[PDB]
Design a protein around this ligand. Sequence first.
Ligand SMILES: CC(=O)O[C@@H]1[C@H](O)[C@@H](O)[C@@H](CO)O[C@@H]1S(=O)(=O)N1CCC(OS(N)(=O)=O)CC1
Ligand SMILES: [Zn+2]
Length: 257
Amino acid sequence: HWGYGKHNGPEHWHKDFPIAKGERQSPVDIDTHTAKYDPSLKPLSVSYDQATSLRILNNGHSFQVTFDDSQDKAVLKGGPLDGTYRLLQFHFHWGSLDGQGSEHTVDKKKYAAELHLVHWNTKYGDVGKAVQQPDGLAVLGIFLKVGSAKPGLQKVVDVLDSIKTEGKSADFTNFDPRGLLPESLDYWTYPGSLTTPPLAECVTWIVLKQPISVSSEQVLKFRKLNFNGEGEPEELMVDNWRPAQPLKNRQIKASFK
Ligand SMILES: CC(=O)O[C@@H]1[C@H](O)[C@@H](O)[C@@H](CO)O[C@@H]1S(=O)(=O)N1CCC(OS(N)(=O)=O)CC1
Ligand SMILES: [Zn+2]
């Protein structure tokens, strides 16, 4: 019954998931002046042209768009990664106000939201097995700021009324996640974890330097979603972000100077 409230939020999670206080937890603050440029980092390879979106779902802690990951259709490769990572789903974290909502921060700056494109390493065969491995997942993180609208996001926001409450899902085919990407693929990378329970330490994080801009109307539609199931007291789905965790014995690497 974990969540993001006063009595079940991130400060409580360690009781059910003691790895919450582990050695490679996420998110973290990205100190841009301390991140080390690593000229050996290869360019990110994002191959999304054959992506097959399936469903969109309110899972009670966010909403997610799920993809067919039974074939190499939408994959992430290169960068700090060895091998091929299949896109399983994407989801967002966002705030009650534009000055908060992101999980990662940049020089302590919070963005209005953060997009996570979740991929798993095909050498482990399925995502359940991948989450048990130190290099099982690669999550591509993209910051959202409020300004101009993001046209590629609009098809997502327009269906959110149909999945307002926990458990609701809808058909969401032929969605192209390339429409969510910024111009630059410049990134920071570090070894980390899931940012929701079970907080497994299985993620190579790849966080893009360039945020995308979304409109105030687009983020307002995020904030109209509900944590609760239908018929329960309405609690707006906002501030579903875990705060920055201690960096401990890790170095964030940058793909750029
Ligand atoms: C669907 C979902 O919300 O997460 C589940 C689950 O919590 C986790 O134990 C594992 C089991 O299937 O992974 C999936 S997930 O792959 O789709 N999932 C989504 C949210 C988590 O993303 S996060 N915020 O680290 O980036 C990563 C794992
Ligand atoms: Zn996430």
